[PDB]
Amino acid sequence: HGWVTDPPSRQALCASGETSFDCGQISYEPQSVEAPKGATTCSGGNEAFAILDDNSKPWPTTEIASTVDLTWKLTAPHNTSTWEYFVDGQLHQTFDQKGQQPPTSLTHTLTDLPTGEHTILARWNVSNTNNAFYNCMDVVVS
Ligand SMILES: [O-][O-]
Numbered sequence: 429h430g431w432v433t434d435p436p437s438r439q440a441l442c443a444s445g446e447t448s449f450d451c452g453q454i455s456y457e458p459q460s461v462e463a464p465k466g467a468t469t470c471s472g473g474n475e476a477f478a479i480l481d482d483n484s485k486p487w488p489t490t491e492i493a494s495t496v497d498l499t500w501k502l503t504a505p506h507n508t509s510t511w512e513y514f515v516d517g518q519l520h521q522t523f524d525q526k527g528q529q530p531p532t533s534l535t536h537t538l539t540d541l542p543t544g545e546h547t548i549l550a551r552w553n554v555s556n557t558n559n560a561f562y563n564c565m566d567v568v569v570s
């Protein structure tokens with residue numbers, strides 16, 4: 429269990445009261461967006477958190493540079509295979525944790541992000557279950 433706090437993920441914005449709409453249950457447990465491996469959606473297909481896939485909502489965006497430090501908060505630091513970062517659904521960078529336990533505060537540096545409005549999907553793959561955690565971040569790169 430864990431989520432991306434900076435730049436804030438969709439679930440982080442719900443939990444921080446930064447959205448102008450009610451997100452429902454996700455606002456109380458941003459760490460819990462768990463679903464089977466292999467998805468490329470913001471909820472991972474976890475039906476309890478389908479609001480995270482709704483692009484019609486006025487999701488806030490964060491202004492960032494083309495190289496950015498991204499920070500996770502993990503409440504339960506499961507042994508991890510990879511952290512995968514997608515930009516608009518296409519794989520951009522992978523970090524290999526080698527099946528080890530990560531720190532509960534973890535920062536990764538993404539580079540060469542395209543300019544303009546994009547959605548980054550961070551997929552955290554757990555090495556000893558069939559689940560991943562899914563975090564979308566809406567950003568404007570300049
Ligand atoms: O706890 O996954």
Ligand SMILES: [Cu+2]
Binds near residue numbers: 430504506
């Ligand atoms: Cu967990």
